[PDB]
Amino acid sequence: SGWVWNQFFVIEEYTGPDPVLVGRLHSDIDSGDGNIKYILSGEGAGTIFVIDDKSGNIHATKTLDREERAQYTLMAQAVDRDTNRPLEPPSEFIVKVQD
Amino acid sequence: SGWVWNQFFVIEEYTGPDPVLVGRLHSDIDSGDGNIKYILSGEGAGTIFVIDDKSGNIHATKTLDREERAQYTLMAQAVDRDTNRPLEPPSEFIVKVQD
């Protein structure tokens, strides 16, 4: 419908050594049995942004400076914990570092 | 698809008498010329949660406690700034008060 909902943000001074919550990848088919696995990839994945593939929560790990980088494009995936076959179609989302 | 992008969150220990950024409403028909007006409705709209109807930035105005309220369900709308004709269908979104 043209609404845009697939972005998170981190309000920056909150960033540093201590990990802060960015957001949660989540499919509506996740019954909570923990048999779906969330795969994060893209800009800053596995360094700046890290995910728990059971809970789907993304954290920021470093001090971030909006001047150096305004935002990051990451890719979401939801695959089955055992077949590893995609449930949801992979989709991009953006993380915006806040002023 | 079944991806869920329409929930913001607020970390408890940042809420207070200082407004915290919650999220941005945004349509892709927004051309950044201020002709689209962002409207918020439902639980806490216009008290707890406040919008700038031009940028679409949402803010939390109060301390929040997930013990008292885990969750706020609200409604996002967009109208033409002077005709007030809706430009999008309403879209429900929820804000989660984070542990």
Swiss-Prot record, chains A, B:
List the range of the whole protein covered here: 54 to 151 of 796
Instruction: Write out the tissue specificity statement of the associated record.
Output: Selectively expressed in osteoblastic cell lines, precursor cell lines of osteoblasts, and primary osteoblastic cells from calvaria, as well as in lung, testis, and brain tissues at low levels.
Q: How does it assemble?
A: Interacts with PCDH8.
Q: What is this protein called?
A: Cadherin-11
What does the UniProt entry state concerning the protein's domains? Three calcium ions are usually bound at the interface of each cadherin domain and rigidify the connections, imparting a strong curvature to the full-length ectodomain.
What are the subcellular locations of this protein? Cell membrane
Domain of life, per lineage:
Eukaryota
Q: Which residues form the Cadherin domain?
A: 2-99
Q: What does this protein do?
A: Cadherins are calcium-dependent cell adhesion proteins. They preferentially interact with themselves in a homophilic manner in connecting cells; cadherins may thus contribute to the sorting of heterogeneous cell types. Required for proper focal adhesion assembly. Involved in the regulation of cell migration.
UniProt organism field: Mus musculus
